Design a protein around this motif. Structure first.
Motif, PDB file in Angstrom:
ATOM      1  N   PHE A 240       0.864  -1.169   0.000  1.00 17.61           N
ATOM      2  CA  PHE A 240       0.000   0.000   0.000  1.00 17.61           C
ATOM      3  C   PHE A 240       0.905   1.225   0.000  1.00 17.61           C
ATOM      4  CE2 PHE A 240      -4.018  -2.001   1.298  1.00 17.61           C
ATOM      5  CZ  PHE A 240      -3.556  -3.225   1.739  1.00 17.61           C
ATOM      6  N   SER A 241       0.796   2.060  -1.026  1.00 23.01           N
ATOM      7  CA  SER A 241       1.489   3.339  -1.056  1.00 23.01           C
ATOM      8  C   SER A 241       0.540   4.412  -0.540  1.00 23.01           C
ATOM      9  CB  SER A 241       1.905   3.659  -2.487  1.00 23.01           C
ATOM     10  OG  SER A 241       2.585   4.897  -2.553  1.00 23.01           O
ATOM     11  N   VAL A 242       0.983   5.185   0.457  1.00 24.85           N
ATOM     12  CA  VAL A 242       0.091   6.096   1.168  1.00 24.85           C
ATOM     13  C   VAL A 242       0.660   7.494   1.350  1.00 24.85           C
ATOM     14  CG1 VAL A 242      -1.050   4.191   2.367  1.00 24.85           C
ATOM     15  CG2 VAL A 242       0.869   5.368   3.457  1.00 24.85           C
ATOM     16  N   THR A 243       1.900   7.747   0.940  1.00 23.06           N
ATOM     17  CA  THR A 243       2.493   9.061   1.176  1.00 23.06           C
ATOM     18  C   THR A 243       1.906  10.137   0.270  1.00 23.06           C
ATOM     19  OG1 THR A 243       4.288   8.299  -0.247  1.00 23.06           O
ATOM     20  CG2 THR A 243       4.644   8.155   2.120  1.00 23.06           C
ATOM     21  N   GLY A 244       1.409   9.751  -0.899  1.00 22.93           N
ATOM     22  CA  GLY A 244       0.763  10.644  -1.835  1.00 22.93           C
ATOM     23  C   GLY A 244      -0.596  10.082  -2.201  1.00 22.93           C
ATOM     24  N   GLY A 245      -0.815   9.782  -3.475  1.00 29.04           N
ATOM     25  CA  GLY A 245      -2.019   9.071  -3.857  1.00 29.04           C
ATOM     26  C   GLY A 245      -2.053   7.677  -3.262  1.00 29.04           C
ATOM     27  N   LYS A 246      -3.258   7.124  -3.151  1.00 26.33           N
ATOM     28  CA  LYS A 246      -3.450   5.831  -2.500  1.00 26.33           C
ATOM     29  C   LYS A 246      -3.407   4.736  -3.557  1.00 26.33           C
ATOM     30  CE  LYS A 246      -3.663   7.932   1.381  1.00 26.33           C
ATOM     31  NZ  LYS A 246      -3.246   9.265   0.866  1.00 26.33           N
ATOM     32  N   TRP A 247      -2.260   4.077  -3.647  1.00 29.34           N
ATOM     33  CA  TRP A 247      -1.992   3.093  -4.676  1.00 29.34           C
ATOM     34  C   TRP A 247      -1.754   1.713  -4.071  1.00 29.34           C
ATOM     35  CZ3 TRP A 247      -3.093   6.836  -7.678  1.00 29.34           C
ATOM     36  CH2 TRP A 247      -2.391   8.048  -7.678  1.00 29.34           C
ATOM     37  N   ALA A 282       9.041  -1.898  -2.364  1.00 33.50           N
ATOM     38  CA  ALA A 282       8.851  -1.311  -1.047  1.00 33.50           C
ATOM     39  C   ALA A 282       8.549   0.168  -1.242  1.00 33.50           C
ATOM     40  CB  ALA A 282      10.096  -1.468  -0.172  1.00 33.50           C
ATOM     41  N   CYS A 283       7.786   0.736  -0.314  1.00 29.43           N
ATOM     42  CA  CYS A 283       7.380   2.132  -0.376  1.00 29.43           C
ATOM     43  C   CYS A 283       7.975   2.881   0.807  1.00 29.43           C
ATOM     44  CB  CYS A 283       5.856   2.254  -0.340  1.00 29.43           C
ATOM     45  SG  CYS A 283       5.032   1.503  -1.764  1.00 29.43           S
ATOM     46  N   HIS A 284       8.564   4.037   0.526  1.00 35.46           N
ATOM     47  CA  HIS A 284       9.218   4.832   1.549  1.00 35.46           C
ATOM     48  C   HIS A 284       8.192   5.320   2.567  1.00 35.46           C
ATOM     49  CE1 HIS A 284      11.450   8.240   3.282  1.00 35.46           C
ATOM     50  NE2 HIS A 284      12.506   7.501   3.001  1.00 35.46           N
ATOM     51  N   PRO A 285       8.562   5.414   3.849  1.00 31.01           N
ATOM     52  CA  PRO A 285       7.547   5.754   4.862  1.00 31.01           C
ATOM     53  C   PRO A 285       7.027   7.170   4.783  1.00 31.01           C
ATOM     54  CG  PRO A 285       9.714   5.572   5.872  1.00 31.01           C
ATOM     55  CD  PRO A 285       9.826   4.986   4.488  1.00 31.01           C
ATOM     56  N   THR A 286       7.798   8.125   4.249  1.00 24.63           N
ATOM     57  CA  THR A 286       7.333   9.507   4.250  1.00 24.63           C
ATOM     58  C   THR A 286       7.361  10.179   2.884  1.00 24.63           C
ATOM     59  OG1 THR A 286       9.519  10.341   4.886  1.00 24.63           O
ATOM     60  CG2 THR A 286       7.970   9.856   6.665  1.00 24.63           C
ATOM     61  N   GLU A 287       8.239   9.742   1.986  1.00 27.98           N
ATOM     62  CA  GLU A 287       8.376  10.346   0.665  1.00 27.98           C
ATOM     63  C   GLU A 287       7.772   9.423  -0.383  1.00 27.98           C
ATOM     64  OE1 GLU A 287       9.875  13.361  -0.088  1.00 27.98           O
ATOM     65  OE2 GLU A 287       9.887  13.600   2.101  1.00 27.98           O
ATOM     66  N   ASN A 288       7.408   9.996  -1.533  1.00 30.18           N
ATOM     67  CA  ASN A 288       6.878   9.208  -2.649  1.00 30.18           C
ATOM     68  C   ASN A 288       8.042   8.563  -3.395  1.00 30.18           C
ATOM     69  OD1 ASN A 288       4.202  10.194  -2.067  1.00 30.18           O
ATOM     70  ND2 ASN A 288       4.700  12.041  -3.222  1.00 30.18           N
ATOM     71  N   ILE A 289       8.591   7.515  -2.789  1.00 31.00           N
ATOM     72  CA  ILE A 289       9.741   6.785  -3.305  1.00 31.00           C
ATOM     73  C   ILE A 289       9.429   5.299  -3.250  1.00 31.00           C
ATOM     74  CG2 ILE A 289      12.165   6.218  -2.980  1.00 31.00           C
ATOM     75  CD1 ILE A 289      12.519   8.955  -1.596  1.00 31.00           C
TER      76      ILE A 289
END
Lengths: 308, 9
Positions: A240-247, A282-289
Motif C-alpha cells: 500500500f502506497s500512502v504518502t501521496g495518492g493511494k496506490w 517497497a514504499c518509503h515511509p514519508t516520501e513518494n519513493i
C-alpha cells in the motif's frame, strides 16, 4: 470538477553490488536506509535518498529470501535457506542471535511494531513467533500444509496474517496463538503474498493466477481485485502506497513495477527498467519513493521518485 | 548459492 491524480514515478538510481538475485528490499522505519537481501547470502544497507552503498552484512551459510527492520531502525532480521533467521545490529553488522527450529528454508519474516517479537514462515509449513531478546521460539503455529509465503503483524501487533501455497490466508491472535479466521477461494490458488493494510482492517493477498485482492478479513469479503500484471511463479511483494495518492504497488514477472489506483483498480503506471522478474517492491515511509529489486539476470535495486 | 524466493514454482 476534481481531477484524479496519477503518479509520475521516474528512475533516480540503480543500486548494483549483489552478485546473485535480490530477494527483498525494505526501507527502514526512519526513512534513512534501504536493506536488501540476496541469494548471494548477503544483506546490504543503502542510503534511501541517494542509493549510496553503506555496508554489507554477512554470516548466513546459504541464500536469503527476506529481511525486515525493527521499528527503532536498529535491528534487522533475515530468513535463509540455511533454515535459520538471524537478528543483526545494523550499526555494527554483528549477528546478535541465530533463530533455530525451522526444519526447511525460512522464507519470510517480520518484526511486530514493538519489535519484541519476530514472526517467520518456512517451507516447513509452520509459522513461528520468536522472542527478540532471548532468540528463542515462543510459539509454533500449525498454520499451513504447504510452504508459508508471507507473514505480517497488524499495526498494534495483536494479529498475524500468514499465507501459503496451500491456498489459505489465516489470521492469528498473537497472544493466544489461535486462528481467528481462515480466508478461502473456491479453487484455492496458491497464495504467494499477504500483508495487512496500514489501518489494520484489510489484507492484500497475491495468488499465483495473476491476481491481487484486497479483503476485509473480518467480514470475509473481497473488496477489490487488481489484474494486468504477471504472477504465476514467484512470491512477489506488494504494498500500500500512502504518502501521496493511494496506490497498490507490486512487482511482476514481465519485469515491470505495476501501480494501481486502490479504489478504481485501474493501472496508473508501469515502471520499466529491470531485466528480470521484479520480486520485491517497497514504499518509503514519508516520501513518494519506491524501491524495486529483481532476480538473477538483473541483480539490481532501483529507486524511483514521484511528485504525488 | 540460491534462495527459495528466487526460484520459481
Amino acid at each position: 470538477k476534481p481531477t484524479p491524480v496519477k503518479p509520475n514515478y521516474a528512475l533516480k538510481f540503480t543500486l548494483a553490488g549483489h552478485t546473485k538475485a535480490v530477494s527483498s528490499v525494505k526501507f527502514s522505519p526512519n526513512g534513512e536506509w534501504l536493506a536488501s537481501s540476496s541469494a548471494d547470502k548477503l544483506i546490504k544497507i543503502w542510503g534511501a535518498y541517494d542509493g549510496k552503498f553503506e555496508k554489507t552484512i554477512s554470516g548466513h551459510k546459504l541464500g536469503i529470501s527476506d529481511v525486515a527492520w525493527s521499528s527503532d531502525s536498529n535491528l534487522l532480521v533475515s530468513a535463509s535457506d540455511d533454515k535459520t533467521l538471524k537478528i543483526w545490529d545494523v550499526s555494527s553488522g554483528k549477528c546478535l542471535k541465530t533463530l533455530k527450529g525451522h526444519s526447511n528454508y525460512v522464507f519470510c519474516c517480520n518484526f511486530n511494531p514493538q519489535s519484541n517479537l519476530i514472526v517467520s514462515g518456512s517451507f516447513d509449513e509452520s509459522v513461528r513467533i520468536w522472542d527478540v531478546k532471548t532468540g528463542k521460539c515462543l510459539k509454533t503455529l500449525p498454520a499451513h500444509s504447504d510452504p508459508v509465503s508471507a507473514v505480517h503483524f497488524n499495526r498494534d501487533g495483536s494479529l498475524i496474517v500468514s499465507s501459503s501455497y496451500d491456498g489459505l490466508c489465516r489470521i492469528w491472535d498473537t497472544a493466544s496463538g489461535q486462528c481467528l479466521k481462515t480466508l478461502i477461494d473456491d479453487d484455492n490458488p496458491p497464495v504467494s503474498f499477504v500483508k495487512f493494510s496500514p489501518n489494520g482492517k484489510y489484507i492484500l493477498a497475491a495468488t499465483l493466477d495473476n491476481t491481487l485482492k484486497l479483503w476485509d478479513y473480518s467480514k470475509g469479503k473481497c473488496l477489490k481485485t487488481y489484474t494486468g500484471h504477471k504472477n504465476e511463479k514467484y512470491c512477489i511483494f506488494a504494498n500500500f502506497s500512502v504518502t501521496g495518492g493511494k496506490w497498490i504497488v507490486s512487482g511482476s514477472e514481465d519485469n515491470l513495477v505495476y501501480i494501481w489506483n486502490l479504489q478504481t483498480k485501474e493501472i496508473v503506471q508501469k515502471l520499466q527498467g529491470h531485466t528480470d522478474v521484479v520480486i520485491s517492491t517497497a514504499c518509503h515511509p514519508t516520501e513518494n519513493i519506491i524501491a524495486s529489486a529483481a532476480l538473477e539476470n538483473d541483480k539490481t535495486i532501483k529507486l524511483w521518485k514521484s511528485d504525488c
